[PDB]
Design a protein around this ligand. Structure first.
Ligand SMILES: NC(=O)c1ccc[n+]([C@@H]2O[C@H](COP(=O)([O-])OP(=O)(O)OC[C@H]3O[C@@H](n4cnc5c(N)ncnc54)[C@H](OP(=O)(O)O)[C@@H]3O)[C@@H](O)[C@H]2O)c1
Ligand SMILES: NC(=O)c1ccc[n+]([C@@H]2O[C@H](COP(=O)([O-])OP(=O)(O)OC[C@H]3O[C@@H](n4cnc5c(N)ncnc54)[C@H](OP(=O)(O)O)[C@@H]3O)[C@@H](O)[C@H]2O)c1
Lengths: 374, 374
């Protein structure tokens, strides 16, 4: 539980200048502090450079990276940091690597929590929740204790939704609206599938939203989606497909992707992550929206409270967001969303011992983790 | 030796629109055709998305990717292309994957030839040159036969320098000035090292040039380099270091990098590659320069002709370049450059059977391949 223990910089990033705003590069904004857990993993190995290049926050936004890793993968983190220095990225004003959350999360304005333990060979969902839940329970206290009171936290380590509930549950000082579960890779994969069916390039499909858990209970919402400007429903008139098939296509994208030999969707996920961050740092296009697993309290859809449930949101580009109100539902959608909700509330109970609710009671389906995920 | 055999597109990229310049996105330039060999490898897995994101050619430059792979790694290429489609990159107007150079290199304006066979466990340099030389001999004929008469070719597969000589030697219709050997990762690594020693951030070091082969005979030129605006020589006054140590630090960067467990400098190399391309597509900053293994004919330094020797160049950002004339040399520099030249001319002879010169005569040192390279 550190205090006074500040994070040490990394070679060259220690030799950095004053602060962009007054001598050279006065065009640059004030530096943004970004923390990344799972910093030595594959998604990170992609994400990091996209951040450093200004692809994420812009070309006039000097960045500071605080890479949180783990004992075992420390050599790896040193390596990534070594690649970071040989990249000569001007925006990357400073980087620091370490294994202590209370040190690394120190002053973080964005906490991109990718990284959690992989599903064991014969591991039951409940324990998958327990193990990673603990990691996130801890990172939550750290964030709470030593991070910017308005840290925008973005969770990608599975089970992301619950992992996020836990994180905010252990980080009371931090606004729960700030915690996001990454369902965006799912959104992108779904646009691609709706473009593929309709015979249009993915840049013509929009208003795609994902509801529920980042698991096989999520719902690639085709009812409110649009292609070219008109509801998907009246472009892909094959209604049976949309209901009986669409979902399973997005739901297995990663699974087929992995068949093209063993690599995870690192590059794509790395991309989803930046698109995710941008949807909060950039004003949502007129009439469109993005998907994010966020806290349910305040939602107008009727979804249960006290959980992290992905839903349509729009932003003015300030880090915050608001739920999208102009949306419709039917028997299909309504029942599918409610079915994911059931799952989530069960994980919640199964994770009562890491959320501060009480004794855990697990009754979960060991078949829901998305194909292709580590 | 295809003709009439055109490259088929890939799912979603087949459903693409007209051509940016007249309906929507009239701000966009005319599409650029980019071919990538070794498309399913690690450096590519990084490079590709940087290209697609517009990081390389700009945000108003729609791109077309022609990914050349190999039979064995075809499943992998399908996978990368699958990640490409789930990324929803607007600039990535079209992509096509395949294993035939005469098909894939069809109409290429940029041929980023990363990818060649790795050094065998007990493989002698000569054969390393032979094996990869053949690949490049073939890709050269293809490029020559079916590519844009002004293809800018950028070789990264080792032995890059010779591999490039061979490529242009088998591609007579294509201007030899167009072939580039990637010595940029080396340049970047060296700036980082000169920044580290002088106690300044890498953004204060400039005019670093690399001469010779992309091997342990190259010369991280500290004599013409500058820090803050004044020659490195009068900032890092520890002259013995610059001569006796500097070189070995850059020369082993990859070697130490790999010690931080088994991953190649994929992310960094991916970065060097884009910096390389930009130095040709962007006007070189006033007084600075970049390093590139290019054809020697016309050089004013005294370096031997008919080889690919990295040297200082500047560009107006049109794809072409010119050698930098305002540069000095001393006993140290002069002798070191000449020693790399010796190597190169020996590889040249060792590769006479792939260059159209005659019977090969190999007499090479089996210790020169840079630490950390596959
Ligand atoms: N939401 C999505 O769509 C999505 C997509 C892909 C993956 N995921 C999920 O995210 C998790 C892993 O992501 P991945 O596939 O990218 O794996 P990965 O790149 O291989 O990274 C896994 C990480 O676990 C890390 N680790 C263990 N304990 C940690 C802790 N105390 N703090 C920080 N890092 C810790 C390791 O740390 P080091 O960094 O030190 O190695 C390692 O990097 C999985 O549960 C996976 O299912 C979600
Ligand atoms: N200049 C530099 O500083 C630098 C830096 C790093 C590496 N390199 C050199 O580049 C070469 C490999 O790069 P790497 O480390 O990035 O390896 P990598 O990512 O693992 O890729 C190696 C590739 O060899 C490919 N291949 C074999 N025959 C091919 C052909 N007919 N056409 C197209 N691709 C072919 C494979 O094809 P698939 O794409 O189908 O798998 C594979 O991707 C090595 O010789 C290495 O030393 C140079």
């Amino acid at each position: 539980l550190p205090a006074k223990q500040k994070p040490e910089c990394f070679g060259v990033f220690c030799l950095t200048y004053d602060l962009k705003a007054e001598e050279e590069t006065k065009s640059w904004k004030k530096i943004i502090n970004v923390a990344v857990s799972g910093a030595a993993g594959m998604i990170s190995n992609h994400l990091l450079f996209k951040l450093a290049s200004g692809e994420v926050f812009g070309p006039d936004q000097p960045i500071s990276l605080k890479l949180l890793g783990s004992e075992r993968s420390f050599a790896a983190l040193e390596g990534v940091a070594m690649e970071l220095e040989d990249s000569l990225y001007p925006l990357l004003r400073q980087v620091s690597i370490g294994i202590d959350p209370y040190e690394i999360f120190q002053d973080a304005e964005w906490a991109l929590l990718i990284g959690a333990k992989p599903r064991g060979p014969g591991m039951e969902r409940a324990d998958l929740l327990d193990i990673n839940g603990q990691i996130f329970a801890e990172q939550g206290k750290a964030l709470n204790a030593v991070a910017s009171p308005n840290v925008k936290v973005m969770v990608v380590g599975n089970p992301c939704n619950t992992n996020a509930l836990i994180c905010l549950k252990n980080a009371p000082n931090i606004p729960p609206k700030n915690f996001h579960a990454l369902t965006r890779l799912d959104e992108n994969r779904a646009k691609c599938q709706l473009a593929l069916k309709a015979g249009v390039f993915y840049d013509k499909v929009s208003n795609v939203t994902i509801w529920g858990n980042h698991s096989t209970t999520q719902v690639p919402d085709f009812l409110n989606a649009k292609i070219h400007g008109i509801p998907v429903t009246e472009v892909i008139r094959d209604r049976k497909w949309l209901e009986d098939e669409f979902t399973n296509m997005v739901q297995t994208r990663g699974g087929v992707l992995i068949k093209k030999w063993g690599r995870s969707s690192a590059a794509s996920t790395a991309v989803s992550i930046v698109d995710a961050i941008r949807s909060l740092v950039t004003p949502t296009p007129e009439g469109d929206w993005f998907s994010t697993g966020v806290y349910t309290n305040g939602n107008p859809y009727g979804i249960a409270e006290d959980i992290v449930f992905s839903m349509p949101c729009r932003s003015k580009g300030d880090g915050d967001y608001e739920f999208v109100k102009d949306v419709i539902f039917d028997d299909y959608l309504s029942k599918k969303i409610k079915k994911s909700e059931d799952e989530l509330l069960a994980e919640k109970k199964c994770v009562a011992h890491l959320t501060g609710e009480g004794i855990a009671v697990c009754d979960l389906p060991e078949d829901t983790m998305l194909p292709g995920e580590m």
